[PDB]
Design a protein around this nucleic acid. Sequence first.
DNA 1: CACAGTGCTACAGACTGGAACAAAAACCCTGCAG
Lengths: 85, 82
Amino acid sequence: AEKEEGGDVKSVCLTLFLLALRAGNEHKQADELEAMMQGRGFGLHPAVCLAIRVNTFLSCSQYHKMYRTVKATSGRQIFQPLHTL
Amino acid sequence: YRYDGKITNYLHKTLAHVPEIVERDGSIGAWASEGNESGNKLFRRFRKMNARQSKTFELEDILKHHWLYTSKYLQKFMEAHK
DNA sequence: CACAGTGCTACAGACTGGAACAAAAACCCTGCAG
């Protein structure tokens, strides 16, 4: 890190790994991994969450209720928590 | 002056037959109308949000959806086990 | 002593790190045994 960046932790791990996987490759993973960080969501971008709360009329406590449920059962939580909304 | 010939039904009922019925049922207030009544709130929202909506089918889907609201099986899931 | 909430607050709980301790798991081993 010192010679080529100086404190850039994320990328060194990311570029070796995605491509290392697609080395002995079935592709399946490349979709999930190429989506994984910057575009988009992964889970769902907090703006899409916010809209899907505000615009379907979910009570805050109701929303969180759902969030807990989807998180605990088979999760891999999707929805973003309240304080990040 | 206010109780000479007149007493409200409940003041009498609560001053007379309470010890007897608590002795008999074992308890009271667990048997209260509250567990009904409250439910009425739902009947209003389930007549707007979840209604069909026309006079024919409306009671049908309110009733159904209410039944679904009441079931334990679902609430168990919605506890999410702590 | 009805009860499911009512949002935003409060800061409780979840995290690292080396520095080092200890316990326990399940091997290999050597010990003392028919």
